[PDB]
């Protein structure tokens with residue numbers, strides 16, 4: 001039994017059913033939305049810091065922590081030892097993934113660049129896991145439609161996101177950039193960075209003078225590290241205390257629309273006036289993750 005799907009490398013044929021899966025580099029919250037944690041035998045170690053992973057994975061001790069590095073060679077010997085039927089992986093190094101795929105194990109490989117693409121890739125995974133994701137994907141889209149409707153006619157705020165260091169930002173073909181855009185941010189990184197995330201000189205950041213700055217949830221930087229950086233003292237975002245760390249939500253996953261909502265609410269609070277934000281957040285978690293009221297509580301905002 002099999003199913004044909006498409007990924008980064010073209011058509012793939014997935015043998016069914018899938019018993020053991022590994023998540024490398026992205027999509028760590030997918031098992032949470034599908035209730036398939038029992039099928040997971042390995043996951044990139046960043047995942048254990050996600051709050052929906054912490055809450056929904058009952059036996060984290062069972063799952064082998066894997067590398068969260070996208071560039072170095074994949075650990076093919078560990079992959080073979082865990083005997084997965086399927087490895088879902090983020091392609092940060094096409095050649096290294098291709099190299100990895102030459103060892104007898106099926107890969108489903110993605111490089112999600114937009115929230116729209118995230119949802120397509122989630123649906124592809126749902127085919128491999130033989131789950132019906134339609135209602136959950138629809139909730140994701142309803143939420144995107146809602147944000148867009150509130151931001152209609154609102155002038156975007158000039159901003160940028162910082163990554164592991166204070167001069168690494170995102171540009172074209174970066175899911176972070178799409179998430180910023182859907183949050184109502186004019187990301188100046190598009191002007192400087194031609195693909196993914198890359199460095200820029202601090203003097204260009206100062207010249208661009210962003211009104212708001214976000215920090216990648218995996219970054220070691222705190223908002224204070226940025227606020228107190230002498231290099232940034234003349235920047236509007238610093239002077240006006242508009243520096244925010246993004247929530248503990250994996251970008252390539254079922255909560256991407258909530259990250260854009262978070263950004264929109266920070267950037268354009270006036271756009272969300274007669275909106276019951278926590279009702280929206282509550283129903284998002286109930287539908288997407290099947291949480292009950294008590295379980296939803298720590299995920300509500302403020």
Ligand SMILES: N[C@@H](Cc1c[nH]c[nH+]1)C(=O)O
Pocket residue numbers: 025026046068069070090218251252
């Ligand atoms: N690819 C995801 C997860 C990750 C953790 N470390 C590196 N990447 C991200 O960049 O947000």
Ligand SMILES: N[C@@H](Cc1c[nH]c[nH+]1)C(=O)O
Pocket residue numbers: 070091092173174175195196197
């Ligand atoms: N997810 C990657 C960033 C990236 C986007 N596109 C390619 N790489 C990281 O953790 O750095």
Ligand code: NI
Pocket residue numbers: 025070
């Ligand atoms: Ni990454």
